[PDB]
Structures are given as structure tokens and as C-alpha cells.
């Protein structure tokens, strides 16, 4: 029975920083992949970042290309998103999805208001 | 990402562009050229076009030997393919997506699965049957046939049903026109990882064992009784030759994706051998006319009344 | 308010109820039971199913043999051609439209169905005008082969297109008939803009009456060994070919006139659609005769089949 | 070239009366049927009334059943709608269509405000 925690995030300074978390529960974690996806206040979900099951190859959108950075802990069942040099449009509710999809399991996410 | 995974589906194409949409919602013309979807419907039409007549004549003429029971059993399942599966995929080729819906996909994949498995397990029966006549291990031993043709449906449904149970699932493949077992996503919720093993084990390896187990008995082996034997035991060979030609490519790519899950492969990679393996409906009876002379005579009897 | 007339269409059903919608927009399940639309697709499938194989073998076998160059074979290949134009041009559209329950393809989607339904009947008709003329010239022997036949089979297409093209010109038009699955000439609305009143005359005159004249004109000439066995069976087949054509086309032709006479009257959707779909057997029955009756063909067909 | 005039109509008594007209031009009039159709200010067109080409059988909606009454002049190429004992919901723009359709061919209409 699947359960993704959505820890890390809050109100942050324009041009600040913040580290996100995502504790996975109830599945073979290392056996598949995990993504980060955010909900901008107004427009549809943006696929932020993603990473392979082994964790070898991360991928980012142009929007947060190199500012954000993604990495996962297979042992602990966790996914992180170190967001740096933030902006006002990075203000959104961040969800961590499984597989390769923008389809969000869990929810509430993390309201990272910049 | 390389491919785009969704609840129902997996599109072998990066949504980096933003273009990717569900094949249970919108047409998938970003995957391939829109005329290639028309080419599928063109190809897929002709499978249904020469599917029904060749199988229906072969079904009719037979009812109007163990071999004939099986090659009627195939004419049955080939018509289940044509009307059950091919119809859906010919219509889906038009729209460019499973417009019928998730259950619309299950149809396509189910009778594609029956067709291959009932074709496979029938060649397991044809393998067993000549070994018992040619090598002559049990003396005077050929209603036997009707029991062993019921076997093919028993085992094919062991393969085709469980996706519909919810162990594994049927999922749009390649151009999102055919459907088949989930080789792509681990989908541990569905546990489809384990099924792919079960299928390549119980519904591929075990059959091909018993086939070449019986075929290997006639390595030391290979008047008119044996002419009838020869041409019909030769047809058993040509029937498998065709089955290997047909199903190998798709089976190979299916495993290749299962091995390299999440890797970079295009939509056409899988769809080509998948649609190629849908000739299983038509080629089987064409052999049964072409090679089996006893049938050919009596087919023309029914035709030319 | 018996029927409901629109820009493109005419629905044989009162829009007193408010239910009536265009058959170029929504399915017409208020007209008949939804399973009857499925029954149409079922029927219409089997026309395409036994349409292609019977016609394609008959097309292939005739051309493959360098023999089989008798006027009869030219016509019955010409039909195998037009019957395949029917199957792929017309029947496909109506089999698909039967599914959805309306001309989903659009106004031009209707034109397809009606056009090759019109060619099929006219090329079948004008071919029986040729078969009528040809068996009079040999049997009664008034004027004492290959070139003759090809000229007179080109005639059938010339005249069929005189009939089928003008709807697409904009004189008359193709319009959904009965259950709104088949299409045909506008017998329903006056549509004087289209002038389709005048066309129906032209068609029943030039493309029905004139043919049936020349048919029975030649048939009336023949009121008063083995060459004549070949003659007999093939001149008998000319008869059976017309017998079938009258069986086929009369019902629809009758209802088509009945509506033309009683425009605006009270008639159901099934009234017209039944004889219309019945007359779409023209694609399949023609070659079935050519195999059944013509023995010389049947031999050579099995040659091609059984290599 | 078709031309339908839409004469008769205006502001009228609650429970009043009014006779409408429809001069047809540019077609064989008696070969055609003719209808009346109104546009309520708010909701979709109502098929008011209709009559056969010969003029034999007039047909009305239950909305205006017996209150309204339709008749046509083949000689003069005209269609009339004698509206009697009117109501506030009879307030609409009336069009005269050809054939049997609520498909409205071009006319002024007539804003009969009750
Ligand atoms: C491939 O990549 C594409 C990239 O776009 C991706 O498309 C996006 O898919 C997601 C779904 O996974 C879509 O998200 C939804 O968008 C809804 C609105 O979308 C329309 O409207 C916006 C503008 O508002 C347009 O930009 C857009 O073009 C659409 O026309 C949005 O309403 C959804 O979010 C609401 O619903 C979720 C789910 O229930 C909820 O959790 C959210 O909170 C949200 O509700 C909000 O509530 C507030 C407060 O009450 C309310 O005021 C507000 O209206 C709601 N929020 C919004 C934004 O309206 C959801 O985010 C996304 O739009 C798609 N983008 C586009 C451009 O299409 C594909 O999915 C990918 N394909 C595959 C197969 O992977
Ligand atoms: C059989 O009879 C039915 C009876 O309903 C006909 O259905 C109606 O057809 C008319 C055709 O014009 C439609 O009229 C149009 O309605 C628009 C609004 O309708 C929608 O929105 C309202 C709410 O605002 C709802 O009440 C309604 O249900 C609809 O969802 C109007 O805005 C249109 O006005 C515009 O065009 C007209 C052109 O005549 C102009 O005069 C206007 O100024 C304006 O620009 C228009 O009046 C009507 O809505 C239909 N009703 C239904 C079912 O919704 C069928 O058409 C008829 N079938 C056939 C085949 O003839
Ligand atoms: C999309 O699929 C491609 C394959 O088609 C994936 O590329 C693979 O990426 C991994 C990790 O970066 C590569 O592993 C490394 O490759 C080097 C060089 O070949 C090897 O020496 C190292 O030991 C290491 O294993 C892998 O080889 C590579 N495959 C190829 C052949 O390209 C990629 O992960 C997918 N893209 C994403 C991010 O989804
Ligand atoms: C619908 O068609 C019917 C005929 O099917 C029409 O019925 C005629 O009605 C007129 C009176 O308006 C009579 O004079 C005729 O004798 C009727 N014919 C018969 C014998 O049924 C009817 O007019 C049409 N409906 C409308 C209102 O157009």
C-alpha cells in the first residue's frame, strides 16, 4: 500500500535556497524511478526533474536547468530536490511522482512560496 | 525522460517536448507520421480481409484426423483474432489511439494472446502426435485429438486471462495501436514483472522444449501410408517454421524491452514486429490448403458445389 | 411537419418532438432501434466481405488468362471493376456510417456512398444494354469480338458518369436516405436551387427507361451443336443477369419514385433504407452468376486458384 | 436569387393581436412549403407553425396551439401568421423558413415585443 511523504519546503527568500524530501513507503523503491513535479499557482503541472531507478542519470527541465538538482537515497527510500537561486515563479506545490509520469501519487506536496 | 509512463499506458517518446498525451485520450501523431497510422490500417485491413474468408472456408470445409481438428481449432482462434482483436486495432489505427478505451486495449491484446498461444500449444500437440506415430513408441495409439485440442485452449487462457485478472496487464505498444503484456513498466502494483517470467517460462520455453524434444526424436528418423505421413509430418514442420518466423521478432523485442526497461527506443521499434506477428491469423490455413492435398480437393468440392 | 428538411439533409421523421438532429452531426437513434444500425453494419460488412474476394478473383482470372476475351468477359470484368469501386468507394463509407449511426465523415462523406452506389447500378444497367445488343447481333444474325467489346464497355462508363457525376456538379445532390446511412438522389426536397426535381426525371428517363426499352427491344427480337451450347448458356446468363438486376433495383427504384411522387408525405425511415441496402447486393451477385452459369470461366478460375 | 420579406409586427398589447407577413421572391413558391419560426430573447428558436405546399394542412406547436394561425397565398407569394391573445413569452423575432426546417433563411424577421 503506497505512501509518499512530501517533506522539506516553505516560505523562502527571493534568490534563496531550500532542500526538499520525499520518503517512499509501500513498494520496491530501487526497482523503479522517481520524479519531481510542481503546481504553479495559475497554470498546469510542470515536470520539474526526474532520475533513473539506479539513480545514475538525473534530468531537469529548462525552467530549472542547473538551479535545481535531484538525487535519491535507495537505502532510505527518499528523493531530494536541492533548489538553489530561487525565483518568484518557482512558487508552487511540489509533488514527487513514481515512474516517468506527471501523474501524482500522494499529495499536499510542499508549498514552496518564494 | 526517455519514455512517458502513465496510469494505463507507456508512450515510448520523451515528454520533454510537452506534446505527449495519453493514447486513451488523443491521437498519437507526434509518435510517427500520420500516414503511417493509415499504413497500419491498410495492412491491418488486409489481415481482416484475407483473414475471415481463408479461415471461414477452412472452418466450413472441415466440418462439412488429429491434424484437421487442430487446423480447425486454429481456423476458430484465427477468427477470434480477426473479429476480436484485428477489428479493434484496425479501428484504433484510424483514430490513431485506443479510442474505445482501456477495455478497448484489453480486446486487442487478449485475442492477440490467444491467437499466439493456441497456435503455440497446437504445435505442441502436433509435435507430440507424429512422434507417437512415426517413431512408434506406443503401438496402436494415434477422440484422442479432441482432448488434446481442448488442451490448447486450457493453456492459452492460462496465458491470456491473467492480464484481465489484474496480474500483468495489456498496454498499448509502440505506435499505441497494438496492445500486449507490460514489458515496459515494473508496475509492481500489477506485479507484471513476475508475469513476463511466467509467460516466457510456461508459455514459450516449456512448449519449445516439447517441440524440439519430439523433433529431436526424428533426427535418426529424418508406402502410401507414409506419403500421407510424410507430407503431413512435413506440414507440421512448415507450420512451426512459419510460427518461428512470425513470433520470434516480437518475442525478441518484448524481451529486449523487458531487459532494458526505461531505455531509449522509438515507437516503431516494437510496433513493426507486433503487427508482423498478426499474420498468425492468415498463414496457418494457407499452409493447410497449400501443403495438405486431401483438404485442397474437398475445399474445391465445397466451393465448386 | 411529417419530415424534417435541413440544408444538407432530410430526416423522414417529425421534429414536432424536438428530437430531430442533422445526420451530419449526431447519430440518428431516434429514427430506428440502435441495434438495427448494428444490423446494417452486419449486413454491410458481409457485402464488403464477399464483395472483394469474388470480384478480385473474377478480375484476376479474366486478365490472367490470355484466353477469355469474349464480349461477355469484358463486361463481367468491367463489373468486377465497378463492383470493387462500390466495395471500396461506397460500402466502406456506409459500413462505417452504420456504426456511428450518421454520416460522420461529412457532406462529402455522403457523396462517396451515393456516387459509387450510382456508378454500380448504372455500369450494371448500361452493361445489360450492351449484353442485350450483343446477343441480338449473333443470334438473330442481322449484321454478318475483341475491339467491338472494348468500345461498348467504354460506353457503360460514359453513360454511368452521365448519371453519377451531376449530383457532384451541383445539379441534384446526394442526400442521406431512410435511416441516414445510405445516400442517393434527392427525391425528397424540391430544392429548386439544386434543381433536383428535373434530374430525377432525367435519370428515370435517360438512365432507366431508355435502357429498359433497348433491353426488351432486343429481347423481343428473340421471340420469333456446341457453338450454340456456348451461345445458349451465355445468352441464358444475359437473361439471368437481367433477372437479377430487376430483382435488385426495382424495389429501391419503386420507393424512390414513390417518394418523388408523394414528397412531404408520411413515411418511415425504414421504408426507403431496406430496398436501398438490398440494392447494394449488385456488387456481389454479378460475378456469382458468371461463375455459377458460365462453365468456361469456372474451369479457369480453379486453374488460377489451384495453380 | 431568393428573397423573403418579413413584414408585419411590432410592440403589442398583453393579450393583444397582430398579423404577420412574409413576401417570398426568387423561387417556385407553390412548389415549396413554408414555416414560421421565432427567436425568444434568451433561449433557442421555436418552430412556431408550418403548412404544406398546396396549403392544405397547417400545423402548430402546442405553445401557440389555436392562439396563432397560419395561412399562405400562392398567387401573391406570401405567408401570414395571425397571432391572437398574445403573451409576454411570445415576445421574439419571427422568421419564415422554407421546406420543413427551423433552418432560417435570410430575413429581417419581425421583433414582436409583447
Ligand atoms: C506531457 O507534458 C504536458 C505538459 O503540459 C502535460 O500536460 C499537463 O498535465 C497536467 C496534468 O498532469 C495538467 O495539470 C492540470 O491543469 C489544470 C488546468 O489546465 C488548464 O488550465 C491551465 C490554466 O489554468 C492551462 O495552462 C492549461 O493549458 C489547461 O487548459 C489544473 O486545473 C489542474 O490543477 C488543479 O487540479 C489538480 C488535480 O485535481 C489539483 O490538485 C490542483 O490543486 C488544481 O486545482 C487548483 O485549485 C485552485 C484553488 O481552488 C483553483 O483556483 C485552480 O483553478 C486550480 N489550478 C489550476 C491551475 O487551474 C492540473 O494542474 C496541465 O494543465 C497540463 N498542461 C497543459 C498545458 O496541458 C501532460 O500531462 C504530459 N503528458 C503525459 C501523457 O504525461
Ligand atoms: C429540431 O427542433 C429542435 C428544437 O429544439 C431544434 O433545436 C434548436 O435549434 C435551434 C436552431 O437555431 C437552436 O437555436 C439557437 O440556440 C442558441 C442558444 O441555444 C443554446 O443555449 C440556450 C441558452 O442560452 C439553451 O436554451 C439551448 O438549449 C442551447 O444550449 C441561440 O443563441 C442561437 O441564436 C443565435 O443564432 C440564431 C440563428 O437563428 C440568431 O437568430 C441569434 O441572434 C443568435 O446569433 C439559436 O437561436 C436551439 O438552441 C436548438 N435547441 C436545442 C435542442 O438546444 C433542432 O435544430 C431541430 N432539428 C433539425 C435537424 O432541424
Ligand atoms: C535513455 O536510454 C539510454 C539508453 O538508450 C540511457 O543511456 C544510458 O545511461 C547510462 C547512465 O548514464 C549509461 O551507463 C553508463 O554508460 C557508460 C558508457 O556507455 C558506461 O561505460 C558506464 O559504465 C555506465 O554504465 C548507459 O550506457 C547508457 N546507455 C547507452 C548505450 O546510451 C539513459 O539512461 C536513458 N535516459 C534517461 C535519462 O532516461
Ligand atoms: C403527412 O402525410 C400524410 C399522408 O401519409 C398526410 O395525410 C393527408 O392529410 C390530408 C389532410 O391534411 C388529407 O386530405 C389526406 O387524405 C391525408 N392522406 C391520407 C389518406 O392519409 C398529411 O397531410 C401529412 N402531414 C402533414 C401535416 O404534412
Q: Residue D111 has what DSSP assignment? A: E
Say if C8 is an interface residue toward chain D (CB within 8 Å): no
Give the three cell numbers for residue A15.
534568490
Q: How many angstroms separate the CA atoms of B96 and B11, rounded? A: 13
Chain center to CA of D105: 12
DSSP for chain B, written as a single string: --SEE-SS-EESS-TTSS----TTTS--TTTS-HHHHHHHHHHHHHHHHTHHHHHHHHHHHHH--HHHHHHHHHHHHHHHIIIIIIHHHHHHHHHTS--S-HHHHHHHHHHHHHHHHHHHHHHHHHHHHHIIIII-SSSS---HHHHHHHHHHHHHHHHHSHHHHTSS-EEEETTTTEEEE--S---TTTTHHHHHHHHHIIIIIHHHHHHHHHHTGGGS---HHHHHHHHHHHHHHHHHHHHHHHHHHHHHHHHHHHHTTT----HHHHHHHHHHGGGHHHHHHHHHHHT-HHHHHHHHHHH--
Give the three cell numbers for residue D68.
396563432
Q: How many angstroms separate the CA atoms of C7 and C167, rounded? A: 15
Q: Which of D52, D61, D101 sits opposite C4 (nearest CB)?
A: D101
The count of domains in chain D is 1
**Which has the closest alpha carbon to B18: A47, C125, D103, C200?**
A47
Q: How many angstroms separate the CA atoms of B170 and B179, rounded? A: 6
**What separation in angstroms does the CA of C198 have from each of A97, B208, C253, C272?**
69, 72, 16, 21
DSSP strand pairing (A92-95 vs A34-39): antiparallel
Neighbour tally for B158: CB within 10 Å: 15
CA-based nearest residue in chain D for residue C4: D100
Does the annotation list C197 as a binding residue?
A: yes
Q: How many angstroms separate the CA atoms of C99 and C294, rounded? A: 37
Neighbour tally for B105: CB within 10 Å: 28
Ligand 4: centre distance to CA D30 (Å): 17
**What separation in angstroms does the CA of B67 have from each of B57, B209, C88, D7, D63?**
16, 21, 37, 85, 74
The count of domains in chain C is 1
Q: Residue D11 has what DSSP assignment? A: B
- Count of positions (residues) in chain A: 114
Q: How many angstroms separate the CA atoms of A58 and A54, rounded? A: 10
Instruction: Determine the atom of ligand 3 nearest the C-alpha atom of A51.
Output: 38
What is the residue range of A71's domain? 3-112
Q: Which residue shows C-alpha cell 502494483?
A: B189
Give the three cell numbers for residue B68.
484437421
Output the residue whose Cα is nearest ligand 4's atom 6: C265
**Which has the closest alpha carbon to B240: B130, B161, B165, B139?**
B130
Give the three cell numbers for residue B194.
513476475
The CATH number assigned to the domain holding C284 equals 1.20.1070.10
Q: How many angstroms separate the CA atoms of C287 and C84, rounded? A: 11
SS (H, E, C) chain C: CCCEECCCCEECCCCCCCCCCCCCCCCCCCCCCHHHHHHHHHHHHHHHHCHHHHHHHHHHHHHHCCCCCCHHHHHHHHHHHHHHHHHHHHHHHHHHHHHHCCCCCCHHHHHHHHHHHHHHHHHHHHHHHHHHHHHHHHHCCCCCCCHHHHHHHHHHHHHHHHHHCHHHHCCCCEEEECCCCEEEECCCCCCCCCCHHHHHHHHHHHHHHHHHHHHHHHHCHHHCCHHHHHHHHHHHHHHHHHHHHHHHHHHHHHHHHHHHHCCCCCCCCHHHHHHHHHHHHHHHHHHHHHHHCCHHHHHHHHHHHCC
The CATH number assigned to the domain holding D46 equals 2.60.40.10
Give the distance between the most distant pair of CA atoms in chain B: 70
Contacts of residue C246, defined as CB under 8 A and 6 or more positions apart, other chains included, come to: none
Chains touching A, CB cut-off 8 Å, 3+ pairs: B
Give the distance between the most distant pair of CA atoms in chain D: 38
**Interior angle at CA B186, CA B180 and CA B188, nearest 5:** 110
Find out whether the beta carbon of D59 lies less than 6 Å from any atom of ligand 4. yes
Q: How many angstroms separate the CA atoms of A85 and A13, rounded? A: 9
Q: Are B92 and B62 in contact (CB under 8 A)?
A: no
Residues in B closer than 8 angstroms to A99, CB to CB, are 5, 185
Resolution (A): 4.2
Q: Are D72 and D59 in contact (CB under 8 A)?
A: no
What is the residue range of C155's domain? 1-307
**Which has the closest alpha carbon to D46: D95, D4, D106?**
D95
Residue C173 backbone phi and psi in degrees, to 5:
-170, 160
Q: Which residue shows C-alpha cell 448458356?
A: C233
**Interior angle at CA D91, CA D88 and CA D97, nearest 5:** 145
Neighbour tally for C235: CB within 10 Å: 18
Amino acid at each position: 500500500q503506497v505512501q509518499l511523504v512530501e517533506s522539506g519546503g516553505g516560505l523562502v527568500q527571493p534568490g534563496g535556497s531550500l532542500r526538499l524530501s520525499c520518503a517512499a513507503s509501500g513498494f520496491t523503491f530501487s526497482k523503479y524511478a522517481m520524479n519531481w513535479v510542481r503546481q504553479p499557482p495559475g497554470k498546469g503541472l510542470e515536470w520539474v526533474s526526474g532520475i533513473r531507478p539506479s539513480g545514475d542519470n538525473p534530468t531537469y527541465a529548462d525552467s530549472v536547468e542547473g538551479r535545481f538538482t535531484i538525487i535519491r537515497d535507495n537505502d532510505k527510500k527518499m528523493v531530494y530536490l536541492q533548489m538553489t537561486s530561487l525565483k518568484t515563479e518557482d512558487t508552487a506545490v511540489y509533488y514527487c511522482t513514481r515512474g516517468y509520469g506527471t501523474m501524482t501519487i500522494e499529495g499536499q506536496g510542499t508549498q514552496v512560496t518564494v | 525522460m526517455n519514455g512517458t509512463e502513465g496510469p494505463n499506458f507507456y508512450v515510448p517518446f520523451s515528454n520533454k517536448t510537452g506534446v505527449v498525451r495519453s493514447p486513451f485520450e488523443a491521437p498519437q501523431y507526434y509518435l510517427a507520421e500520420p500516414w503511417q497510422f493509415s499504413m497500419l490500417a491498410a495492412y491491418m485491413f488486409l489481415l481482416i480481409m484475407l483473414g475471415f474468408p481463408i479461415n471461414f472456408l477452412t472452418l466450413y470445409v472441415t466440418v462439412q484426423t488429429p491434424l484437421n481438428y487442430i487446423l480447425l481449432n486454429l481456423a476458430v482462434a484465427d477468427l477470434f483474432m480477426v473479429f476480436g482483436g484485428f477489428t479493434t486495432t484496425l479501428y484504433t489505427s484510424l483514430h490513431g489511439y485506443f479510442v474505445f478505451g482501456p477495455t478497448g486495449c484489453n480486446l486487442e491484446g487478449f485475442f492477440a494472446t490467444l491467437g499466439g498461444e493456441i497456435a503455440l500449444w497446437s504445435l505442441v500437440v502436433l509435435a507430440i502426435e507424429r512422434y507417437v506415430v512415426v517413431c512408434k513408441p506406443m503401438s496402436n495409439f494415434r477422440n484422442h485429438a479432441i482432448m488434446g485440442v481442448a488442451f490448447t485452449w486450457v493453456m492459452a487462457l492460462a496465458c491470456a486471462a491473467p492480464p484481465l485478472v489484474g496480474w500483468s496487464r495489456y498496454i498499448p505498444e509502440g505506435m499505441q495501436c497494438s496492445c500486449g503484456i507490460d514489458y515496459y513498466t515494473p508496475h509492481e502494483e500489477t506485479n507484471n514483472e513476475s508475469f513476463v517470467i511466467y509467460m516466457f517460462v510456461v508459455h514459450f520455453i516449456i512448449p519449445l522444449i516439447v517441440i524440439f524434444f519430439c523433433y529431436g526424436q526424428l533426427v535418426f528418423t529424418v508406402a502410401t501410408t507414409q506419403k500421407a505421413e510424410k507430407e503431413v509430418t512435413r506440414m507440421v514442420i512448415i507450420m512451426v517454421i512459419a510460427f518461428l518466423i512470425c513470433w520470434l521478432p516480437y518475442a525478441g523485442v518484448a524481451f529486449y524491452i523487458f531487459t532494458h526497461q526505461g531505455s531509449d527506443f522509438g515507437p516503431i521499434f516494437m510496433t513493426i514486429p507486433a503487427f508482423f506477428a498478426k499474420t498468425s491469423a492468415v498463414y496457418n490455413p494457407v499452409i493447410y490448403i497449400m501443403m495438405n492435398k486431401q483438404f485442397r480437393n474437398c475445399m474445391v468440392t465445397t466451393l465448386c458445389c
